[PDB]
Design a binder for this molecule. Structure first.
Ligand SMILES: *[B]([O])([O])C1=[C][C]=C(C2=[C][C]=C(B([O])[O])[C]=[C]2)[C]=[C]1
Length: 358
């Protein structure tokens, strides 16, 4: 890799790992449409297994980008419309508060205050229905944004219903397979466990626990290589052969709502490039990212803007991931670590790296 990329990456990541006490890390920089990989530390501290380009990391909420794109693919296929009412795909959802709540709302966290987490007690199909029937909106739909798994997770499950495929099967067949993400999983198979890194929380080795709508909202595990390939596919969707997938990727980068200077896509969040570092850095901090904010509808949605900083943070109990790319610059980065460290530190480092690369 160019000494320039090598120097900036190392100059930035070294102190990051040291200050955050990150056990293991893998980084991919996509420069002029080509990936460059870097790895440090351990995937498994106890068994002394190093992080390699084949190490699997939990993506946490970066999984929402795969869900937004899978959903976009369904839209392009003509199986669903974001303007459809949620009840069109779940007629059993009869409670009156659902009138007016569309798939767009679910996809974008703007249904009116659906919670960040689906309650732990919700673990059954009937339990899910019950939960949604009893949920009381705090706001009218399309007025406030509240980052939530119960919102996009539901969008995810409803989105694949017409296809007749299960969510994992649709994700694999319609997204993973066509893009050659052959080491990306919702459920990691036994044959691949040897590559599955342990996450670390307060010193303990941990893996994400099962939960309602986990696949749809935070359950994908991947390698730095496949994540780099994901970034490339998102940087140049026109290069994708499967027509509807190309269209789905574009739809997920369209701007549907604006909050402060951030725009909500399907899973991906975007800001106009150039961006103010402090704006994406401070904005990624959960004190802002997880808060209730008024939103302005973009009527109609702006098609994917090539001059944007497209990104998404992701976390599980033991993992911290980040993905960011600038279509206009053919530039991107993937940062996967097996420790959930502050979002600001992630964005700060990613910005130092990409800014120095143009
Ligand atoms: B929990 O009830 O233990 C629970 C479940 C899911 C989350 C969660 C997962 C992923 C993201 B994303 O931003 O990485 C946010 C929240 C939290 C708690």
């Amino acid at each position: 890799a160019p000494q320039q990329i090598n120097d900036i990456v190392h100059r930035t990541i070294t102190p990051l790992i040291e200050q955050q006490k990150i056990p293991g890390m893998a980084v991919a920089v996509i420069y002029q449409g080509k990936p460059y990989y870097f790895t440090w530390g351990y995937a498994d501290i106890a068994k002394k297994q190093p992080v390699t380009q084949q190490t699997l990391f939990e993506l946490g909420s970066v999984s929402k980008t795969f869900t937004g794109v899978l959903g976009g693919d369904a839209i392009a296929r003509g199986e669903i419309k974001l303007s459809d009412p949620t009840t069109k795909y779940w007629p059993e959802l009869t409670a009156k508060q659902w009138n007016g709540i569309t798939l767009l709302h679910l996809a974008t966290y703007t249904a009116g205050g659906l919670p960040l987490q689906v309650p732990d007690e919700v673990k059954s199909s009937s339990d899910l229905l019950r939960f949604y029937q009893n949920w009381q909106p705090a706001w009218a739909p399309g007025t406030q944004r509240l980052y939530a798994n119960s919102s996009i997770g539901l969008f995810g499950a409803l989105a694949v219903k017409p296809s007749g495929l299960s969510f994992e099967q649709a994700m694999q067949t319609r997204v993973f397979q066509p893009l050659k993400l052959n080491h990306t999983w919702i459920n990691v198979p036994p044959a691949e466990e040897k590559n599955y890194a342990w996450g670390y929380r307060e010193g303990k080795a941990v893996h994400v626990s099962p939960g309602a709508l986990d696949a749809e909202a935070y359950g994908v595990k991947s390698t730095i290589e496949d994540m780099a390939r994901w970034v490339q596919s998102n940087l140049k969707p026109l290069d994708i052969n499967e027509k509807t997938l190309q269209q789905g990727i574009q739809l997920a980068q369209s701007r549907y709502w604006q909050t402060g200077d951030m725009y909500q896509g399907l899973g991906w969040e975007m800001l106009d490039w150039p961006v103010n570092p402090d704006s994406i850095i401070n904005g990624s901090d959960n004190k802002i990212a997880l808060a209730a904010r008024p939103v302005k509808a973009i009527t109609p949605p702006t098609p994917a803007v090539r001059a944007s900083w497209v990104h998404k943070t992701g976390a599980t109990g033991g993992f911290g991931s980040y993905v960011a790319f600038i279509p206009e610059k053919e530039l991107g980065i993937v940062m996967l670590a097996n420790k959930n460290y502050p979002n600001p530190a992630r964005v700060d480092a990613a910005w130092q790296i990409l800014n120095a690369l143009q």
